[PDB]
Write a protein that binds this ligand. Sequence first.
Ligand SMILES: C[N+](C)(C)CCO
Length: 422
Amino acid sequence: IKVSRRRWAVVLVFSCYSMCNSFQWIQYGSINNIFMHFYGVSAFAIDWLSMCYMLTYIPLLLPVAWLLEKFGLRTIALTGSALNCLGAWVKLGSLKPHLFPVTVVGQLICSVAQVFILGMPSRIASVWFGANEVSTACSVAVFGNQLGIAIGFLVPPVLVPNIEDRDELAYHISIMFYIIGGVATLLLILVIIVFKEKPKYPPSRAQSLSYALTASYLGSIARLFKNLNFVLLVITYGLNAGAFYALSTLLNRMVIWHYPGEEVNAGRIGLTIVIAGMLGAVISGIWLDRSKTYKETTLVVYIMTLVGMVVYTFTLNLGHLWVVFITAGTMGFFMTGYLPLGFEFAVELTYPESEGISSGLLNISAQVFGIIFTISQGQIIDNYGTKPGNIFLCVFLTLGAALTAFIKADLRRQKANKETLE
Ligand SMILES: C[N+](C)(C)CCO
């Protein structure tokens, strides 16, 4: 058993094109106010580009899990990157006001690329890393996806100003499409040369035993719903992660609703939410490494998310840009930091079930509730304004906060750990 230098190269290249793919998810959402003008469509149409990532994940996750089990790690890496690259190049042919379905086709291809991407941050961690480095590698791969949202918020409004000239607008969006298409192609070329089917030597004793050994997905998902505590977590995780998806997808229509212009700052706020959550996730992760208070920390963070969501809901109105930056970062510290926290707490209640099944069902719950939230809050924003849409998120987070309080600390991994110790 030996570890290899290439393990980091695989992580960064995956994290780079996972960042690239998550760039394309919010690519339209981060500059939603302008893509409305370019294609001449209503708001609900553009969020579907971010929502088609969410709608496609639900039915195709199980077939993609089947593909990974047969064709291995590398083919999913190539297929995810190639579809991300192909979807990026397709968007070049959509640079006209009358070619909106073309970018939908391209975004669907990128959305079909996501199921090959979000499923294997933890999968790469087990294949390439030793036991102590799995949690470090898994975080970096996941934070790469989050960094894509942050970079996908900051960059697109810098490249594309708000201009009503259709032809100059087509010119700037082309540059973003060219860079993202160029970056995806470069990453695809990198994926071809650095990704390998298997390491040279097994990286850990756990991985070596897996290779030496070598239940089903249908059986695992069936037994998981027996655990009431896990069922409660899935509903609450979807209530929180789905709220973040709706908040980030609709962030343009609310920040620019009260602040005309300020597309570049609205991207920074989106970056601030994601970046603060990245800092908040690390703090919570290290805190759990010493305290192991998985239930108490999760409930406090969920409550702090509710207070963070409530405070941002009522501070968005006064019109002070800096206070919106502070509370969005304060909310993101807990709301975005909960996203990796929920996966860690899910393994607590589901050990020894594999992380893939637990993360996948939480991912489905995030997609399902995100779509419900995005559609509903989108209709609430149009019909009743931005604050009721945010309060609508607060109500479900209040329900999520109350529901998490009834979750019992059935930390079966902790029981298993102390059983091995004694
Ligand atoms: C998971 N993302 C936020 C990257 C897209 C929605 O599924």
